[PDB]
């Protein structure tokens, strides 16, 4: 909510969409609560980009996601991230999950409520697509 937080997240998201096209990676935010569009969009885009980016380019994305999570830590009490990834991009998805847990201890319940929405998008997703579902509770 703080306009400062919006400005930084909007900026981190704009860097995220720059890098995504620099790498040729496509993210489609299927669904998001409009009350928290920018927050969810930035986490979903960065988490997706970090799983799909080349390994040598992943730290810069992971760095962006760390910055986003630290800023969102002022407007988000807890955040959960659930990822499905192709076999060749599983460790990358683990680094995203570790980064979110370091920033917000994931906890089992909201981790499984996100996995459900993840699995709901997995029913329509392609076998080689990364699916990221995110749950947040505002401060």
């Amino acid at each position: 909510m703080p306009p400062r937080v919006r400005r930084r997240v909007e900026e981190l998201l704009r860097r995220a969409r720059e890098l995504a096209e620099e790498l040729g990676i496509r993210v489609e935010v299927l669904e998001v609560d409009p009350e928290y569009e920018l927050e969810l969009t930035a986490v979903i885009t960065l988490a997706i980009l970090a799983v799909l980016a080349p390994p040598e380019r992943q730290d810069e994305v992971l760095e962006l996601l760390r910055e986003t999570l630290k800023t969102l830590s002022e407007v988000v009490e807890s955040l959960a991230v659930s990822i499905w990834a192709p076999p060749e991009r599983e460790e990358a998805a683990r680094r995203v999950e570790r980064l979110v847990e370091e920033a917000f201890n994931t906890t089992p319940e909201t981790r499984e409520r996100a996995r459900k929405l993840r699995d709901e998008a997995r029913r329509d997703a392609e076998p080689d697509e990364v699916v990221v579902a995110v749950h947040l509770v505002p401060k």
Partner: peptide, 11 residues
Amino acid sequence: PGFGVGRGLAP
């Protein structure tokens, strides 16, 4: 809901 989902594809 506080929920949001998206997906991604690599080049």
